Amino acid sequence: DIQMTQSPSSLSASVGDRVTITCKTSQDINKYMAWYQQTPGKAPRLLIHYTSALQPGIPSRFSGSGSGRDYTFTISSLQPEDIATYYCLQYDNLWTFGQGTKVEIKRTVAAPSVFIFPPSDEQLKSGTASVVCLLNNFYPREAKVQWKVDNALQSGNSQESVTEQDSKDSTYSLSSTLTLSKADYEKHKVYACEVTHQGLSSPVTKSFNRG
Amino acid sequence: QVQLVQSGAEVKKPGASVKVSCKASGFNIKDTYIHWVRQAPGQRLEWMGRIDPANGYTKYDPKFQGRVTITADTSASTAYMELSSLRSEDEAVYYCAREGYYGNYGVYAMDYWGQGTLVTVSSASTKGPSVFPLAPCSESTAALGCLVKDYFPEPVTVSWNSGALTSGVHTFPAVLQSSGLYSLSSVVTVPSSSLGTKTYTCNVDHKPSNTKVDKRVE
Amino acid sequence: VQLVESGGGLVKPGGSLRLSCAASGFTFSSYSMSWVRQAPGKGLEWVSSISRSTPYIYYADSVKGRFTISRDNAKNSLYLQMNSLRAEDTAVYYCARDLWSPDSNYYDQSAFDIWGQGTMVTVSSASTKGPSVFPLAPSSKSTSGGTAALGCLVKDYFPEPVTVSWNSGALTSGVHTFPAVLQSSGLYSLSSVVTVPSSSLGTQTYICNVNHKPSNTKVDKKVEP
Amino acid sequence: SELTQDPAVSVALGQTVRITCQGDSLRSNYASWYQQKPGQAPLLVIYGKNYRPSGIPDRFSGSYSGNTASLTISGAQAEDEADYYCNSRDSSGDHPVVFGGGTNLTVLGQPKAAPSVTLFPPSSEELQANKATLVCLISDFYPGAVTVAWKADSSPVKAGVETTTPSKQSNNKYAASSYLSLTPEQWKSHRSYSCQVTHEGSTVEKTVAPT
Ligand SMILES: *[C@@H]1O[C@H](CO)[C@@H](O[C@@H]2O[C@H](CO)[C@@H](O)[C@H](O)[C@H]2NC(C)=O)[C@H](O)[C@H]1NC(C)=O
Nearest CA to ligand 1 atom 12: D165
Q: State the pairing for strand pair D103-106/D8-10.
A: parallel
Is A16 in the same domain as A78?
yes
Is C88 in the same domain as C13?
yes
The verdict on B57 touching C (C-beta cutoff 8 Å) is yes
CB A98 within 8 A of CB A25: no
Is A116 in the same domain as A196?
yes
HSE toward the beta carbon, residue B23, CA cutoff 13 A: 7
Distance from CA of B32 to the nearest CA of D (A): 9
Is C156 in the same domain as C102?
no
Could you give the dihedral angle defined by the CA atoms of residues D31, D36, D41 and D47, in that order, rounded to the nearest 10 degrees? -20
C69-72 sheet: strands from edge to edge = C2-6, C17-24, C77-82, C69-72
Residues 6+ apart with CB under 8 A from C63: C47, C48, C82, C89
Is A202 in the same domain as A126?
yes
Q: What is the domain count for chain A?
A: 2
Is the dihedral angle over the CA atoms B162, B153, A177, A136 positive or is it negative?
negative
HSE toward the beta carbon, residue D74, CA cutoff 13 A: 8
Provide the 10 A C-beta neighbour count for residue B209.
Answer: 16
Nearest CA to ligand 1 atom 27: D104
- 3-class SS at B209? coil
Is C108 in the same domain as C171?
no
Is C115 in the same domain as C158?
no
Way it was determined: X-ray
C-alpha D142 to ligand 1 mean position (Å): 12
**Which domain does A6 fall in, by range?**
1-107
Is A103 in the same domain as A114?
no
Resolution, angstroms, 1 dp: 2.8
Provide the 10 A C-beta neighbour count for residue C92.
Answer: 22
CA–CA separation, B92 and C193 (whole Å): 77
| Distances in whole angstroms, Cα of residue C26 to Cα of each of A113, C29, C107, C108, D109 | 61, 9, 19, 22, 43
**Shared fold status for D1-109 and D110-211:** yes
Domain ranges of chain D: 1-109, 110-211
| CATH number of the domain bearing residue C175 | 2.60.40.10
Provide the 10 A C-beta neighbour count for residue B167.
Answer: 9
List the end-to-end C-alpha distance of chain B, in Å, as a whole number: 41
Residue of D nearest to C112 (CA): D44
CA–CA separation, A195 and A198 (whole Å): 10
Is A103 in the same domain as A113?
no
Domains of chain B (ranges, CATH numbers)? 1-123 (no CATH), 124-218 (2.60.40.10)
CA–CA separation, A96 and C67 (whole Å): 37
A93/C105 Cβ within 8 A: yes
Provide the 10 A C-beta neighbour count for residue B207.
Answer: 14
Q: Which fold has domain D1-109?
A: Immunoglobulin-like (2.60.40)
Q: Which residues of B touch C98 (CB under 8 A)?
A: none
Among the three residues A61, A90, A107, which one is the final residue of a domain in this structure? A107
Instruction: Supply the DSSP symbol for B152.
Output: B
CA–CA separation, D137 and C149 (whole Å): 11
- 3-class SS at D47? strand
Residue of B nearest to D27 (CA): B55
CA–CA separation, A167 and A80 (whole Å): 6
CA–CA separation, B144 and B151 (whole Å): 21
Among the three residues A46, A74, A107, which one is the final residue of a domain in this structure? A107
Is C217 in the same domain as C111?
no
Q: Which residues of C touch A96 (CB under 8 A)?
A: none
Is A12 in the same domain as A101?
yes
Nearest to A198 by CA among A81, A107, A103: A107
- 3-class SS at C131? coil
- 3-class SS at B32? coil
Q: Select from C59, C113, C176 the Cβ nearest to the Cβ of D53.
A: C113
C-alpha A2 to ligand 1 mean position (Å): 54
Q: Which fold has domain D110-211?
A: Immunoglobulin-like (2.60.40)
CB A88 within 8 A of CB A71: yes
A77 backbone φψ class: left, alpha, beta (φ>0; ψ -120 to 50): beta
Distance from CA of C100 to the nearest CA of A (A): 10
Is A38 in the same domain as A83?
yes
C-alpha D86 to ligand 1 mean position (Å): 21
CA–CA separation, C20 and C4 (whole Å): 8
CB B177 within 8 A of CB B183: yes
C-alpha B169 to ligand 1 mean position (Å): 80
Q: Which residues of D touch C116 (CB under 8 A)?
A: 41
Q: Apex CA C29: angle with CA C27 and CA C35, to 5°?
A: 100
Is C168 in the same domain as C99?
no
Instruction: Supply the DSSP symbol for B31.
Output: G
CA–CA separation, C35 and C121 (whole Å): 13
DSSP string, D120-161: EPPPHHHHHTT-EEEEEEEES-BSS--EEEEEETTEEE-TTE
CB A206 within 8 A of CB A115: yes
Is C144 in the same domain as C162?
yes
CA–CA separation, A35 and A72 (whole Å): 10
CB B124 within 8 A of CB B162: no
| Distances in whole angstroms, Cα of residue D176 to Cα of each of A4, A49, D115, D116 | 64, 55, 10, 10
Instruction: Supply the DSSP symbol for D110.
Output: -
- 3-class SS at C183? coil
| CATH number of the domain bearing residue A134 | 2.60.40.10
User: Which residue(s) pair with D151 in the sheet?
Assistant: D156, D194
Q: Write down how long chain D is.
A: 211
CA–CA separation, B179 and B149 (whole Å): 11
The verdict on A87 touching B (C-beta cutoff 8 Å) is yes
CA–CA separation, A104 and A168 (whole Å): 12
Q: State the pairing for strand pair A101-105/A96-97.
A: unpaired
Instruction: Supply the DSSP symbol for D164.
Output: P
Question: Is it true that the peptide bond before B173 is cis, omega within 30 degrees of 0?
Answer: no
C59/D29 Cβ within 8 A: no
CA–CA separation, D88 and C77 (whole Å): 25
Nearest to D22 by CA among D135, D100, D136: D100
Is C119 in the same domain as C184?
no
Is C45 in the same domain as C101?
yes
Tell me, rounded to whole angstroms, the distance of Cα A70 from its chain centroid.
29
Sequence-ordered strand ranges (E) for chain C: 2-6, 10-11, 17-24, 33-38, 44-50, 57-59, 69-72, 77-82, 91-97, 114-115, 119-123, 132-139, 147-157, 163-166, 175-177, 181-182, 188-197, 206-212, 217-223
Contact exists between C and B (3 or more beta carbon pairs < 8 Å): yes
Helices H, strands E: what count in chain C?
0, 19
Is C166 in the same domain as C195?
yes
Q: Using only C-alpha atoms, what is the Rg of chain D? A: 24
Residues 6+ apart with CB under 8 A from D119: C139, D134, D135, D136, D137, D195, D206, D207, D208
User: Is residue D72 classed exposed, middle or buried when 0-12, 13-18 and 19+ CB atoms within 10 A define those classes?
Assistant: middle
Mutate to test the pocket of ligand 1, among D103, D104, D167, D169 (most ligand atoms within 8 A of CB): D104
Is C71 in the same domain as C131?
no
CB C100 within 8 A of CB C109: yes
Residues 6+ apart with CB under 8 A from C28: C71, C73, C76, C77
Provide φ and ψ at B162, rounded to 5°.
60, 35
Is C121 in the same domain as C212?
no
Q: What is the domain count for chain C?
A: 2
CA–CA separation, B153 and B133 (whole Å): 22
CB C112 within 8 A of CB C152: no
**Which domain does C26 fall in, by range?**
1-125
